[PDB]
Amino acid sequence: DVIDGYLKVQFENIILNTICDIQKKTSKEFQSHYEQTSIHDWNRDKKYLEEILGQKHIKVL
Amino acid sequence: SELVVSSPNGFKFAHELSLFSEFINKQQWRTIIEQSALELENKNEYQSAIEFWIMIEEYPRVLEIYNSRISVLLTSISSERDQLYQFGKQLFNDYQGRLKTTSTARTSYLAFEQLLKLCDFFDLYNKEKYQEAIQKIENLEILPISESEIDSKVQDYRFLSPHI
Amino acid sequence: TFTTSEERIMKKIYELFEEINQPNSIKSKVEEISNQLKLGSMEKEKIKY
């Protein structure tokens, strides 16, 4: 359940595409935020071990 | 505060830290209670956090927490709902003098004294006491009983709390 | 009349004309390198060992 009749469909196609564009756009933005987050988490969680290894290295001397 | 919130006597120990006044001045003591109360909210220990906020007389936050956890639980048939409801009936018996005075949180007290009647209404609905349940929601003033009340209650609703 | 392929190859004949003839063209650059040559500016000094 549901010239000018073809123009109706072309205007509806343009509205549907304009709605699809943003949902694809917001999704590539989300992918880029996800990947920058795990890169930031790694370099944060890495440095925390560099500082703890300093806090173990000295203790043998 | 890590010590006080990890203590299996935490509230009693936090009160005992008010006596050690030569080691902890009352400003440091109040802020040990502030940090301990927040680090009980961070645990979902809403009752423990409320008794800590009561220990420093911060009655706005007591009403803010209580209304927030009881609204999210209001209709639920759960042990936390009934345990928090009897705790709320104690806060109504003994603390209502202090709670009914504050300049801030006045609407939070009106909401507290509406939620403690809505819990009593759902208590009777969930126990088939429908004639007593009707009388609990009538004596709550939040609904119209006649057509002649509708534009009043459609205005009164705009001055409730966002927990009702 | 034109065909779409004739319109399109006539476009490519114009596109390849302009790159050769505009002020920043191939023709200009091949006179500047020629000017820098006349004016000695590429004859770097011959150090000997």
């Binding site: 205007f11 343009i14 304009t18 564009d21 917001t26 989300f30 996800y34 990947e35 071990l49 | 999210v72 | -």
Partner: protein, 667 residues
């Protein structure tokens, strides 16, 4: 129908009730008035005929591509668009006439996007060094935007606002600039030399002004109208029927991508109207209740657009705060849908509803990292109390996610075993798995703590928490087996679910041959392996650098350390490949006007249409495809370097753990 006055019936009744008139010259004048009114009604009807002819003539002269889009003059099209946007703002419109103008505005904006996304706009006015001509182009574009906003502010008519919302989206997609080129980092430059700091202000003080002025002109239009425009739009986002509700919600997403330039005011205005919590409650009750199987597919697009607006909010610092200040995780986690164990006849509709929730929950983890720049330059009392996320707030977000994953444990065990009785995996089950492994990597440190805190009380609960931990741990470790070893077979077994993914299954990648779908699968698998290795690192190496749980056993049941060594070698090989492939993509970008017609087919892949495109069009399309594919590759190069460092750390920590564990048997 159109009504005219019956001059015959009127003249007969006026001659029957003649008794009202001083003489017949008055009757014949009341008939003159009726003949004049009929003449102006006839002219009104023919002006409306002529608009309906003119609109259908123009939209057919565009929507068939019968005029070559390169040749279509933007100076003419913007002068037409600026003219007709004025009448599209007139409160004395016909509805029919204002709609006929609106659909013609829409086609002109769409044809201008189809020019931008094939050719550079306005080239004839960068070939003039006239600062006047670009000023005239902004003044036309601005006169269109301030006009489309007037049609929203004035119109009561749903479809006239709806068309203006589609036109405002296309206008903001037109005005947004293409990405700048990536700034290559010469990593070896470590020694002493002094001078070339100070000249670096100048050139950014230009390009940041020149991108700045257009975005500040849009911001200095929105920030005059704000309190009325976002108020009308947030009303329409809940007051409109189905299809136009989606258009208003898409318009709100496009505005929130720009609200940073106002200062997060549209976002703050939505909370100052309860719109965020009201849209959360509108979402959970209607799409995440027990009747989710019965959701109408026309309004499943209303769900997807509502979720894409929550996803657009969580892409901002203040937006993560405002989603937790409406209990987003806890208010989705209470909803009946998440308790449902999926069964085969319905699995696709379950994934369509679960995937946007897992995107939103992954998005809330992202911002919680920027705390590290507190250089105390004291001077000035600008008491703007913006909530820098505290040591509480990332643990709050991670606790609602821990107790989510741990109450819904059997659903997450069925997701994390990947015991796929579906005889092909799909890319959307991998979209869900990429998000699930990321959440367990984020929450991993609470998974260690809530399974190791031995209180002197209920031994019956601490054993249970540790039994859930052991279940999740063996699933996450067996995924690290399945997705590394069978990696290549999985890329050869996955099928597309959509025509979008079939169109990635025909298309080749010029860097790789594979199809583009076999790369999007593979880079989703890079993502699954990366946060599984971050989970393993956060579970193998504890605070104080004590050892945690064993991810790999000693041998050269858990898997053995051969697995970490083979994953390290394959990541070292992939890191060597992508650096040759990046060293091809930057060479292509350094010679694009000198590539072979075969290399232009290898990059563009536009079928038997490939002949049609002009050189300037192909060169612009390849120059932006090469920008995208350099950013895709430099991103995967980071993720795979960090895999190599995580794997070296995992191999060394396990080797050290076993060597100490053996030494403690010889005293």
């Amino acid at each position: 129908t159109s009504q005219l006055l019956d001059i015959i019936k009127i003249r007969e009744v006026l001659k029957n009730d003649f008794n009202r008139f001083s003489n017949e010259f008055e009757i014949e004048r009341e008939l003159e008035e009726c003949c004049l009114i009929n003449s102006s009604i006839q002219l009104y009807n023919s002006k409306l005929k002529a608009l309906d002819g003119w609109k259908s003539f123009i939209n057919i002269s565009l929507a068939q591509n019968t005029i070559e889009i390169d040749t279509l003059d933007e100076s003419l099209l913007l002068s037409l668009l600026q003219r007709i946007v004025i009448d599209f703002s007139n409160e004395r419109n016909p509805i029919e006439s204002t709609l006929s103008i609106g659909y013609t505005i829409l086609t002109i904006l769409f044809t201008l996007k189809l020019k931008k996304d094939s050719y550079q706009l306005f080239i004839n006015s960068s070939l003039t060094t006239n600062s006047t001509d670009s000023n005239v182009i902004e003044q036309k574009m601005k006169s269109i935007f301030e006009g489309l906003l007037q049609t929203v502010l004035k119109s009561p008519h749903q479809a006239i606002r709806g068309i203006s919302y589609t036109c405002l989206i296309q206008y903001l997609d037109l005005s947004a600039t293409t990405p700048t080129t990536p700034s290559l980092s010469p990593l070896s430059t470590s020694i002493n030399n002094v001078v070339e700091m100070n000249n670096k202000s100048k050139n950014k003080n230009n390009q940041d002004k020149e991108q700045g002025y257009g975005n500040l002109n849009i911001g200095l239009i929105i920030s005059k109208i704000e309190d009325k425009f976002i108020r009308i739009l947030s009303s329409d986002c809940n007051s409109f029927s189905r299809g136009w509700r989606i258009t208003a919600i898409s318009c709100m997403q496009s505005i929130l991508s720009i609200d940073n330039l106002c200062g997060h005011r549209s976002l703050m205005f939505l909370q100052n109207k309860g719109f965020i919590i009201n849209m959360i409650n509108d979402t959970c009750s209607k799409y995440l209740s027990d009747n989710w199987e019965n959701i109408d597919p026309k309004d499943l697009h209303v769900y997807k657009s509502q979720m894409s607006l929550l996803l657009k909010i969580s892409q901002q610092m203040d937006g993560v705060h405002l989603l937790m200040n409406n209990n987003v995780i806890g208010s989705f986690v209470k909803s009946p849908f998440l308790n449902y164990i999926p069964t085969d006849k319905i699995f696709g509709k379950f994934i369509e509803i679960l995937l946007p929730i897992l995107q939103l929950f992954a998005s809330l983890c992202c911002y919680c990292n920027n705390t590290s720049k507190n250089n105390g330059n004291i001077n000035n009392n600008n008491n703007v109390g913006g909530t820098v996320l505290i040591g509480s707030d990332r643990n709050e977000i991670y606790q609602e996610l821990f107790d989510f994953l741990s109450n819904h444990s059997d659903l997450f065990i069925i997701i994390l075993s990947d015991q796929s009785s579906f005889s092909h995996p799909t890319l959307s089950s991998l979209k869900v798995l990429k998000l699930t492994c990321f959440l367990f990597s984020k929450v991993s440190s609470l998974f260690f703590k809530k399974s190791t805190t031995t209180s002197s009380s209920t031994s019956t609960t601490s054993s249970h928490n540790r039994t859930q931990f052991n279940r999740f741990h063996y699933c996450l470790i067996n995924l690290l087996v399945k997705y590394s070893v069978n990696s290549k077979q999985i890329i050869e077994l996955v099928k597309p679910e959509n025509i979008d993914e079939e169109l990635l299954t025909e298309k080749i990648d010029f860097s790789y041959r594979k199809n583009q779908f076999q790369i999007l699968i593979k880079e989703t698998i890079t993502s699954i392996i990366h946060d599984l290795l971050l989970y393993c690192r956060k579970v193998s190496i504890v605070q104080d650098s004590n050892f945690g749980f064993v991810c790999f056993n000693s041998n050269l049941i858990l898997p053995s350390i051969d697995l970490a060594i083979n994953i390290l070698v394959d990541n070292i090989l992939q890191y060597s490949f992508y650096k040759v492939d990046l060293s091809q993509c930057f060479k292509l970008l350094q010679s694009y006007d000198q590539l072979t017609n075969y290399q232009y087919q290898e990059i563009l892949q536009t079928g038997e249409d490939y002949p049609a495109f002009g050189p300037t069009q192909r060169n612009h399309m390849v120059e932006n495809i090469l920008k995208e594919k350099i950013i895709d590759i430099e991103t995967q190069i980071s993720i795979i370097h960090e895999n190599i460092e995580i794997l070296l750390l995992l191999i060394v920590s396990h080797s050290f753990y076993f060597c100490n564990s053996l030494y403690l048997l010889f005293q």
